[PDB]
């Protein structure tokens, strides 16, 4: 019993975190085989940041302007190159602790674990969701750039996020591990609007199933709805539309609980329209949308990893 | 910016988790040097559990009734003994991955990371608090017994909890690593009442400071209070009394925010009496008490570990 915001075990990622310094700027890098990945804005000065020409700035850099450290170990940079917004520092020694890994680009609404780091050392781990507007609501201080987000599938770490920036609005933005930003954001110090953020509807349904599995079910009603009628109510409340793919993904939780997906949708419809009347669900007074159906199934059935 | 429920990096603990089987019962053990620790109820049958005589049951067990596994590796048990409620299985090989470690008994109101495991394999990591009534609100399925809770101090893992049981009430109970239960609980299948649970007042104040540091401060008022007057209000709402030691612990957050501790206490007093009027604090519609002052300072200043 019980339901918690749960991150993946971080051990396989911990052994990959190093420190990257360029001038006065220190941030984190990801050391896999003989390559260190980090945000390319590490090469900017405080004057460069307002409108950097990264091609020009990188040409001005030498290998020895990049100070990479793993623990007590200095890693010698053999070469530097740029893939989109990510710097690749080839080093002369492959990380002996390199796990089996993939680089993946995740979908808005999907979740991942962040290993927040400073000076190449792990500070803590927590679960995030990629918001529909391609931001994340992280916990990041100065020096946290280069921290990565990841999932674990069997024995393979799927790296999906590298932290680049905090926007003037306090929210967080970054790239996949090929250096492509999630969302419309650019790595320059300028005002950048994120989109209207919406609530991840399929995730809220998943969490309501989690509540039911844990005996918390006061919100259930005796109604059903059509996908079309539910959606007409959900857009009024800034909830993402629900698709048939979403209904199909919730199938396993429907079967475990004996509650049809469209019946749970009818329950959510009434919660949106009436509120919670001062009650709580799974210890929360608000509807939670940062758990995917898979997260719920993994937590309520005990999926483990090598 | 941002504030999240953050666990310690789990890598040093991951390398210590093994599987312990006795008969049909499989659970998790903690392998440090040449000793495997696990709950002593692993030796019970389904009939033994209602009123086990653990001394008698253990005498009936042979070394070969304990099947210990670390990955593909079978660990040969050289000896078995009982320290309070914890079984100690001496094995013939010391864990090469044994980190520097301590065993500690934590205080109600203090927090720790749980590495939830099944079949000796890590499933996920999440932060808990030791409730004032010595339970924890975990996420634990069958087979999760033997999962441990821990803190990290510099380069040393301080093990503080081992999971033993889910009570008929859905909440979770366990021991320190010397096998002494937290709280009044016993390892037999009988109805056991936990105490009235109370809210950890110093933790709520810490989280209000966290909100202020993150720009979330609508709840501040222009009042102060005495420790005595605050406490008279707090007991009405099932909040633990606040001591001078608690005020002293909050000093650093008071200095960072420019808000005196007794001024924050005056703000909490009014939140308890008036509610939140449909607002939120750090993305929560309820007052949160599972962050210690140290947790806030570590997260808002970036404490890291070896
Ligand atoms: C991460 N280490 C810092 C740096 N940073 C940043 C640097 C350069 C640029 C630009 F525009 F591309 F040149 N943009 C951003 C940034 O945003 N950082 C960061 C990240 N997360 C949180 C914080 C909190 C406080 C200060 C900086 C943060
Ligand atoms: C943990 N593996 C299980 C087993 N267990 C338990 C076994 C024996 C005894 C007794 F009384 F000492 F003999 N008491 C308890 C227990 O409580 N487990 C457990 C722990 N956390 C969560 C769950 C969820 C579902 C089923 C069992 C759980």
XYZ file of C-alpha atoms and ligand atoms in Angstrom:
668
model
C 0.000 0.000 0.000
C 0.913 3.646 -0.399
C 1.705 5.893 -3.339
C 4.714 8.204 -3.563
C 6.539 10.273 -6.147
C 9.267 7.728 -6.885
C 12.463 8.195 -8.914
C 14.552 5.493 -10.544
C 17.654 4.294 -8.688
C 20.362 6.713 -9.734
C 23.498 4.574 -9.316
C 24.176 3.942 -13.004
C 23.954 7.684 -13.730
C 26.005 8.775 -10.702
C 29.164 7.182 -12.144
C 28.822 9.330 -15.307
C 28.699 12.797 -13.715
C 31.801 15.009 -14.012
C 32.619 18.688 -13.593
C 33.270 20.951 -16.591
C 34.867 24.355 -16.113
C 35.444 27.014 -18.769
C 36.870 30.249 -17.397
C 34.794 31.278 -14.386
C 31.894 28.998 -15.424
C 31.603 25.571 -13.748
C 28.755 23.153 -14.579
C 28.107 19.405 -14.937
C 28.905 17.023 -17.765
C 27.850 13.487 -18.688
C 30.806 11.141 -19.324
C 29.905 8.162 -21.530
C 32.674 6.144 -23.200
C 35.287 8.782 -24.189
C 32.868 11.730 -24.635
C 31.737 14.368 -22.120
C 28.396 16.060 -22.873
C 27.418 19.419 -21.406
C 25.519 22.596 -22.401
C 27.303 24.630 -25.026
C 26.654 27.860 -23.094
C 29.539 26.800 -20.839
C 31.765 28.631 -23.356
C 29.944 31.969 -22.996
C 31.123 34.930 -20.986
C 28.622 37.129 -19.185
C 28.728 39.510 -22.156
C 28.430 36.667 -24.688
C 25.152 35.413 -23.242
C 22.822 38.125 -24.550
C 23.357 37.098 -28.194
C 26.097 34.458 -28.554
C 27.493 33.383 -31.918
C 28.324 29.861 -30.774
C 30.172 28.930 -33.970
C 32.459 31.941 -33.528
C 32.869 31.454 -29.767
C 33.731 27.769 -30.128
C 36.373 28.464 -32.791
C 38.066 30.728 -30.235
C 38.304 27.906 -27.654
C 41.227 25.514 -27.203
C 41.082 22.045 -25.686
C 42.948 23.351 -22.637
C 40.252 25.955 -21.935
C 38.025 22.999 -20.894
C 38.837 21.692 -17.408
C 37.040 18.356 -16.882
C 37.196 16.571 -13.545
C 35.818 13.238 -12.306
C 36.429 13.086 -8.566
C 40.158 13.528 -7.954
C 40.783 12.784 -11.650
C 41.540 15.388 -14.299
C 40.348 14.252 -17.739
C 42.403 15.530 -20.668
C 40.254 16.913 -23.483
C 41.418 15.593 -26.876
C 38.809 17.424 -28.977
C 35.760 19.695 -28.796
C 32.740 19.860 -31.085
C 29.154 21.072 -31.088
C 26.000 19.057 -31.776
C 23.092 21.518 -31.812
C 23.069 23.024 -28.266
C 25.332 20.395 -26.675
C 29.109 20.461 -26.437
C 30.949 17.163 -26.958
C 34.379 17.035 -25.309
C 36.283 13.981 -26.482
C 38.608 12.806 -23.711
C 41.536 10.409 -23.773
C 39.994 7.856 -21.396
C 36.696 6.006 -21.621
C 34.571 5.998 -18.472
C 35.016 2.526 -16.916
C 31.605 3.005 -15.282
C 29.722 3.526 -18.587
C 26.365 1.695 -18.313
C 24.371 0.372 -21.233
C 22.568 3.438 -22.545
C 20.341 5.022 -25.199
C 19.548 8.639 -26.065
C 15.791 9.223 -26.425
C 13.544 12.196 -27.109
C 10.497 11.996 -24.868
C 6.933 13.176 -25.498
C 5.157 15.903 -23.537
C 3.345 14.259 -20.637
C 6.035 11.602 -20.093
C 8.068 11.455 -16.884
C 11.710 10.942 -15.956
C 14.126 11.075 -13.029
C 16.449 14.060 -12.611
C 19.801 13.550 -10.906
C 20.501 17.125 -9.813
C 24.240 17.780 -9.561
C 26.690 20.555 -8.619
C 30.421 20.555 -9.443
C 30.000 17.108 -10.950
C 28.656 15.650 -7.707
C 25.129 14.251 -7.211
C 22.947 16.276 -4.829
C 19.650 14.357 -5.076
C 17.155 12.617 -7.327
C 13.517 13.414 -8.075
C 10.854 12.613 -10.642
C 9.692 15.183 -13.219
C 7.203 15.341 -16.075
C 7.827 17.011 -19.421
C 5.017 19.574 -19.288
C 2.750 19.955 -22.340
C 4.461 23.331 -22.934
C 7.874 21.565 -22.900
C 9.081 23.049 -19.626
C 9.824 21.128 -16.455
C 9.080 22.128 -12.858
C 12.441 21.182 -11.403
C 14.575 22.115 -8.414
C 17.770 23.617 -9.829
C 20.311 26.106 -8.419
C 23.237 27.856 -10.066
C 25.751 25.308 -11.267
C 23.003 22.737 -11.875
C 23.281 23.011 -15.662
C 24.335 19.737 -17.229
C 22.310 17.628 -14.789
C 20.442 14.945 -16.741
C 17.025 13.292 -16.752
C 16.625 9.610 -17.494
C 14.529 6.488 -17.371
C 15.669 2.910 -16.827
C 14.298 0.085 -18.984
C 15.499 -3.325 -17.815
C 19.292 -2.831 -17.760
C 19.478 0.225 -20.057
C 19.578 3.904 -19.036
C 17.566 6.004 -21.509
C 18.899 9.533 -21.204
C 16.201 11.978 -22.222
C 17.041 15.416 -20.789
C 19.945 17.714 -20.049
C 19.287 20.860 -18.036
C 20.255 24.133 -19.753
C 18.434 27.095 -18.291
C 16.097 28.656 -15.809
C 13.818 31.130 -17.531
C 13.084 34.564 -16.021
C 9.740 32.987 -15.040
C 11.403 30.440 -12.713
C 10.686 27.356 -14.796
C 13.241 25.068 -16.410
C 14.197 24.220 -19.989
C 16.685 21.957 -21.692
C 17.509 19.572 -24.503
C 17.624 15.957 -25.446
C 21.120 14.446 -25.473
C 21.525 15.336 -29.137
C 21.203 18.975 -28.058
C 17.748 19.770 -29.498
C 15.726 21.925 -27.124
C 12.393 20.703 -25.915
C 9.987 23.500 -26.766
C 10.624 26.825 -28.503
C 13.550 27.813 -26.291
C 17.006 29.032 -27.310
C 20.238 29.198 -25.291
C 20.594 32.951 -25.073
C 19.804 35.286 -22.175
C 16.601 36.763 -23.533
C 12.986 36.788 -22.416
C 11.290 33.622 -23.711
C 7.624 32.816 -23.216
C 6.557 29.272 -22.564
C 3.191 28.268 -23.909
C 0.030 28.082 -21.891
C 0.640 25.075 -19.676
C -2.124 22.494 -19.676
C -2.911 19.606 -17.351
C -1.957 16.114 -18.563
C -5.370 14.459 -18.553
C -4.290 10.843 -19.040
C -1.882 11.244 -16.117
C -4.656 12.553 -13.821
C -6.816 9.541 -14.706
C -3.856 7.256 -13.938
C -3.444 8.887 -10.504
C -7.177 8.482 -9.805
C -6.741 4.783 -10.538
C -3.781 4.797 -8.138
C -6.074 6.300 -5.508
C -8.672 3.563 -6.087
C -6.076 0.761 -5.899
C -5.102 2.262 -2.524
C -8.680 2.309 -1.208
C -9.228 6.055 -1.791
C -12.379 6.265 -3.886
C -14.925 8.785 -2.533
C -14.860 10.582 -5.928
C -16.319 7.671 -7.911
C -19.825 8.261 -9.251
C -22.386 6.131 -11.095
C -22.016 7.933 -14.432
C -20.310 7.345 -17.734
C -19.483 9.727 -20.578
C -18.375 9.702 -24.164
C -14.827 10.663 -25.045
C -16.289 13.602 -26.997
C -18.471 14.861 -24.130
C -15.657 14.504 -21.601
C -13.306 16.448 -23.858
C -15.811 19.304 -24.191
C -15.661 19.682 -20.403
C -11.897 19.193 -20.186
C -10.954 22.012 -22.578
C -12.933 24.464 -20.449
C -10.513 23.638 -17.597
C -7.221 23.730 -19.579
C -6.908 19.917 -19.660
C -5.312 18.272 -22.674
C -7.757 16.386 -24.925
C -8.077 12.677 -24.233
C -7.541 10.392 -27.235
C -8.434 6.763 -27.897
C -4.709 6.010 -27.530
C -4.999 7.388 -23.986
C -7.998 5.176 -23.228
C -6.099 2.160 -24.567
C -3.091 2.990 -22.380
C -5.314 3.011 -19.280
C -6.701 -0.487 -20.025
C -4.558 -2.347 -17.447
C -5.624 -0.027 -14.602
C -9.259 -0.330 -15.680
C -8.952 -4.131 -15.456
C -7.216 -4.122 -12.075
C -9.853 -1.822 -10.550
C -13.019 -2.925 -12.324
C -13.667 0.706 -13.302
C -14.138 1.423 -17.007
C -11.942 4.210 -18.344
C -14.933 6.289 -19.468
C -16.441 5.796 -15.999
C -13.322 7.235 -14.422
C -13.574 10.058 -16.973
C -17.106 10.741 -15.717
C -15.703 10.976 -12.168
C -12.990 13.428 -13.246
C -15.600 15.523 -15.090
C -17.488 16.039 -11.825
C -14.326 16.813 -9.845
C -13.445 19.532 -12.365
C -16.934 21.044 -12.128
C -17.567 20.691 -8.381
C -14.110 20.713 -6.852
C -13.074 18.365 -4.074
C -15.220 19.972 -1.328
C -12.297 20.066 1.077
C -11.410 16.384 0.774
C -8.091 14.885 -0.310
C -6.993 12.155 -2.711
C -3.792 10.213 -1.939
C -2.822 12.898 0.561
C -3.261 15.732 -1.963
C -5.866 18.493 -2.064
C -5.233 19.019 -5.810
C -5.475 16.757 -8.839
C -1.990 15.422 -9.688
C -0.789 15.011 -13.294
C 2.899 14.035 -13.026
C 2.284 10.236 -12.912
C 1.896 8.345 -16.171
C -0.172 5.155 -16.458
C 3.123 3.259 -16.645
C 4.411 4.964 -13.482
C 1.261 3.810 -11.647
C 1.509 0.254 -12.982
C 5.220 0.076 -12.144
C 4.642 1.337 -8.595
C 1.488 -0.689 -7.860
C 2.965 -3.915 -9.313
C 6.674 -3.573 -8.456
C 8.676 -3.321 -11.680
C 12.420 -3.539 -10.979
C 15.685 -3.082 -12.877
C 19.103 -4.674 -13.270
C 14.462 27.990 -8.217
C 11.936 25.277 -7.477
C 11.306 22.937 -4.572
C 10.790 19.184 -4.874
C 10.665 16.131 -2.648
C 14.254 15.021 -3.241
C 15.922 11.741 -2.237
C 19.627 11.090 -1.828
C 21.463 9.433 -4.724
C 20.972 5.731 -4.145
C 24.051 4.274 -5.873
C 26.013 3.379 -2.741
C 22.995 1.512 -1.332
C 22.078 -0.235 -4.599
C 25.278 -2.320 -4.498
C 24.288 -3.698 -1.053
C 20.838 -5.098 -1.892
C 20.469 -8.892 -2.172
C 17.622 -11.397 -2.164
C 16.933 -13.638 0.843
C 14.650 -16.645 0.510
C 13.491 -18.967 3.289
C 10.999 -21.585 2.141
C 8.281 -19.841 0.140
C 9.205 -16.418 1.594
C 11.437 -14.114 -0.491
C 12.438 -10.628 0.729
C 15.400 -8.218 0.600
C 18.622 -8.161 2.581
C 21.396 -5.620 3.142
C 24.889 -7.005 2.418
C 27.658 -5.106 4.232
C 31.107 -6.686 4.590
C 30.373 -10.411 5.184
C 26.946 -9.978 6.862
C 23.455 -9.942 5.320
C 20.762 -8.142 7.346
C 17.055 -8.791 6.865
C 13.839 -9.008 8.938
C 13.738 -12.016 11.209
C 10.145 -12.793 10.170
C 11.644 -14.269 6.992
C 11.880 -17.524 8.990
C 8.149 -17.650 9.800
C 5.581 -19.807 8.082
C 2.060 -18.522 7.550
C 1.018 -20.362 10.719
C 4.043 -19.096 12.677
C 3.177 -15.445 12.104
C 0.252 -15.117 14.518
C 2.469 -15.682 17.582
C 6.027 -16.686 16.616
C 8.585 -17.899 19.146
C 11.565 -16.581 17.199
C 14.155 -18.218 19.461
C 12.523 -21.608 18.880
C 11.967 -21.036 15.149
C 15.557 -19.927 14.573
C 16.977 -22.971 16.380
C 15.059 -25.106 13.871
C 16.745 -23.397 10.885
C 19.930 -24.539 9.147
C 22.312 -22.363 7.159
C 21.125 -24.061 3.966
C 17.511 -23.015 4.594
C 18.671 -19.442 3.778
C 19.067 -18.834 0.037
C 20.897 -15.516 -0.495
C 21.445 -14.139 -3.981
C 23.242 -11.049 -5.308
C 22.502 -10.822 -9.022
C 23.623 -14.070 -10.655
C 25.657 -14.865 -7.520
C 24.623 -17.309 -4.812
C 26.091 -16.332 -1.431
C 26.839 -19.232 0.908
C 25.572 -18.638 4.443
C 28.240 -19.535 7.028
C 26.171 -18.660 10.115
C 22.838 -17.238 11.279
C 22.039 -15.194 14.373
C 19.409 -12.809 15.686
C 19.890 -9.248 16.937
C 16.527 -8.081 18.295
C 14.169 -8.210 15.250
C 16.907 -8.475 12.605
C 18.480 -11.636 11.240
C 22.234 -11.573 10.582
C 23.382 -14.094 7.968
C 27.160 -14.328 7.944
C 28.346 -15.184 4.433
C 31.694 -16.418 3.173
C 32.415 -13.390 0.969
C 32.552 -9.710 1.860
C 30.639 -7.367 -0.438
C 33.277 -5.679 -2.644
C 30.840 -2.774 -3.045
C 30.565 -2.047 0.714
C 30.506 1.761 1.160
C 31.610 3.598 4.267
C 28.627 3.301 6.588
C 27.108 3.885 10.032
C 23.980 2.536 11.724
C 21.908 5.323 13.311
C 18.612 5.559 15.164
C 16.723 8.614 13.963
C 14.321 10.886 15.850
C 10.634 11.318 15.040
C 10.311 14.198 12.590
C 13.585 13.404 10.790
C 13.644 12.342 7.140
C 15.430 9.714 5.068
C 15.512 8.136 1.615
C 13.926 4.725 1.041
C 15.341 2.476 -1.668
C 12.323 0.242 -2.272
C 13.380 -3.187 -3.535
C 11.867 -6.504 -4.675
C 13.798 -9.780 -5.044
C 16.962 -7.919 -4.115
C 16.588 -5.468 -6.996
C 16.023 -1.701 -6.629
C 12.613 -0.491 -7.833
C 12.815 3.219 -6.934
C 13.839 5.809 -4.374
C 11.761 8.319 -2.421
C 12.018 10.511 0.653
C 10.127 9.708 3.873
C 9.746 11.211 7.335
C 9.649 9.236 10.569
C 6.192 10.298 11.757
C 5.785 11.465 15.373
C 3.904 8.187 16.002
C 6.912 6.238 14.615
C 5.211 5.040 11.445
C 6.187 5.966 7.912
C 3.914 6.712 4.950
C 5.776 4.636 2.395
C 5.041 2.894 -0.888
C 5.651 -0.810 -0.275
C 4.276 -3.973 -1.931
C 4.629 -7.620 -0.975
C 8.265 -8.631 -1.070
C 9.371 -5.110 -0.116
C 10.423 -6.153 3.391
C 14.124 -5.629 3.955
C 14.236 -2.413 1.919
C 16.242 0.189 3.842
C 16.094 3.905 4.604
C 19.230 6.004 4.769
C 20.868 9.391 4.742
C 24.217 10.372 3.253
C 26.629 12.595 5.191
C 29.674 13.548 3.127
C 30.950 10.122 2.004
C 29.172 7.987 4.636
C 25.819 6.190 4.300
C 23.906 6.360 7.601
C 21.452 3.479 7.532
C 18.497 4.305 9.741
C 15.553 2.084 8.752
C 14.707 -1.404 7.578
C 11.155 -2.114 6.452
C 9.370 -4.914 8.342
C 5.619 -4.653 8.053
C 2.498 -3.057 6.721
C -0.078 -2.722 9.466
C -3.750 -3.607 8.885
C -4.233 0.184 8.711
C -2.059 0.511 5.575
C 0.843 2.332 7.197
C 4.406 1.080 7.522
C 6.642 0.081 10.429
C 10.181 -1.143 10.862
C 13.412 -1.103 12.818
C 16.785 0.494 13.027
C 19.635 -1.667 11.716
C 20.190 -3.112 15.177
C 16.663 -4.524 14.910
C 14.879 -2.289 17.453
C 11.435 -1.282 16.231
C 10.591 2.357 15.903
C 7.421 2.786 17.929
C 5.449 0.233 19.947
C 5.262 -2.339 17.158
C 6.107 -6.046 17.271
C 6.806 -8.486 14.424
C 3.750 -10.678 14.774
C 0.549 -10.705 12.716
C -1.716 -9.017 15.228
C -3.706 -5.800 15.291
C -1.418 -2.976 16.461
C -2.544 0.602 16.976
C -0.250 3.437 16.066
C -0.512 6.539 18.175
C -2.395 9.644 17.220
C -0.275 11.071 14.430
C 0.646 14.719 14.818
C 2.004 17.276 12.373
C 5.734 18.058 12.598
C 5.582 21.775 13.339
C 9.252 22.644 12.825
C 9.106 20.934 9.426
C 6.057 22.993 8.357
C 7.883 26.199 9.313
C 10.897 25.027 7.286
C 8.666 24.450 4.234
C 7.110 27.913 4.650
C 10.635 29.322 4.548
C 11.222 27.256 1.401
C 8.125 28.871 -0.093
C 9.428 32.357 0.758
C 12.891 31.654 -0.706
C 11.039 30.661 -3.896
C 8.986 33.871 -4.026
C 5.774 32.300 -2.650
C 4.820 34.465 0.310
C 1.145 35.544 0.267
C 0.705 33.965 3.742
C 3.096 36.336 5.528
C 1.432 38.737 7.957
C 2.630 41.656 10.089
C 2.305 39.828 13.416
C 4.575 38.115 15.880
C 3.818 35.693 18.710
C 5.434 34.142 21.722
C 6.494 30.515 21.632
C 3.966 29.884 24.424
C 1.052 31.574 22.632
C 1.845 29.844 19.343
C 1.962 26.472 21.079
C -1.460 27.045 22.661
C -2.867 27.394 19.138
C -0.829 24.526 17.698
C -2.038 21.862 20.147
C -5.637 22.636 19.192
C -4.726 21.536 15.639
C -2.715 18.376 16.503
C 0.650 20.061 15.810
C 3.669 19.036 17.851
C 4.839 21.659 20.370
C 7.594 23.959 19.165
C 10.671 24.155 21.406
C 13.516 26.654 21.657
C 15.712 23.982 20.042
C 13.342 24.142 17.059
C 13.616 27.930 16.875
C 17.411 27.653 17.014
C 17.401 25.089 14.196
C 15.435 27.491 11.978
C 17.973 30.323 12.481
C 19.710 29.937 9.084
C 16.415 30.141 7.159
C 15.362 33.156 9.225
C 18.620 34.894 8.249
C 18.362 34.031 4.557
C 14.779 35.329 4.343
C 14.820 38.240 6.775
C 11.781 36.742 8.530
C 12.100 36.113 12.267
C 11.159 32.600 13.340
C 8.411 33.841 15.673
C 7.086 35.973 12.801
C 6.802 32.895 10.627
C 5.099 31.202 13.590
C 2.552 34.037 13.615
C 1.901 33.366 9.907
C 1.395 29.637 10.520
C -0.974 30.422 13.413
C -3.254 32.318 11.027
C -3.085 29.617 8.345
C -4.199 27.033 10.914
C -7.111 29.225 12.026
C -8.246 30.600 8.651
C -7.175 27.958 6.168
C -5.588 28.788 2.838
C -8.741 30.248 1.208
C -8.238 28.172 -1.919
C -4.657 29.269 -2.558
C -1.574 27.064 -2.823
C 1.944 27.123 -1.395
C 4.779 25.573 -3.438
C 2.198 23.820 -5.599
C 0.394 22.283 -2.602
C -3.064 23.031 -1.224
C -2.076 21.566 2.181
C 0.639 22.398 4.688
C 3.587 20.011 4.182
C 5.575 18.577 7.116
C 7.973 16.033 5.566
C 10.848 18.524 4.976
C 13.256 19.246 7.809
C 15.089 22.572 8.146
C 18.221 20.750 6.978
C 16.403 19.352 3.927
C 15.392 22.912 2.969
C 18.896 24.299 3.513
C 20.459 21.425 1.563
C 18.057 21.888 -1.358
C 18.111 25.707 -1.439
C 21.928 25.872 -1.101
C 23.049 22.735 -2.977
C 24.724 20.356 -0.527
C 26.378 17.450 -2.366
C 28.045 14.140 -1.507
C 31.040 12.022 -2.465
C 23.301 26.552 -14.926
N 24.485 26.196 -14.575
C 22.972 28.010 -14.920
C 23.581 28.802 -16.093
N 22.410 29.185 -16.894
C 22.549 29.784 -18.186
C 23.799 30.082 -18.702
C 23.910 30.593 -19.981
C 22.745 30.789 -20.710
C 22.772 31.291 -22.129
F 21.855 32.202 -22.345
F 22.593 30.326 -23.018
F 23.908 31.838 -22.430
N 21.526 30.525 -20.220
C 21.433 30.031 -18.978
C 21.222 28.888 -16.256
O 20.097 29.154 -16.654
N 21.531 28.278 -15.057
C 20.562 27.842 -14.113
C 19.792 26.699 -14.300
N 18.854 26.257 -13.457
C 18.647 26.959 -12.352
C 19.354 28.143 -12.016
C 19.131 28.861 -10.816
C 19.849 29.988 -10.538
C 20.801 30.455 -11.426
C 21.050 29.791 -12.592
C 20.340 28.605 -12.928
C 7.237 -7.862 3.322
N 7.961 -8.611 2.569
C 5.863 -8.335 3.674
C 5.832 -9.461 4.726
N 5.228 -8.817 5.900
C 5.183 -9.470 7.173
C 5.653 -10.764 7.327
C 5.665 -11.346 8.580
C 5.200 -10.599 9.653
C 5.224 -11.130 11.060
F 4.112 -10.868 11.704
F 6.224 -10.640 11.777
F 5.368 -12.419 11.092
N 4.722 -9.353 9.520
C 4.715 -8.801 8.298
C 4.748 -7.554 5.615
O 4.139 -6.818 6.378
N 5.032 -7.289 4.290
C 4.672 -6.084 3.626
C 5.343 -4.883 3.834
N 5.033 -3.720 3.254
C 4.013 -3.712 2.408
C 3.236 -4.854 2.087
C 2.166 -4.825 1.159
C 1.459 -5.958 0.879
C 1.768 -7.154 1.501
C 2.793 -7.228 2.399
C 3.571 -6.081 2.720
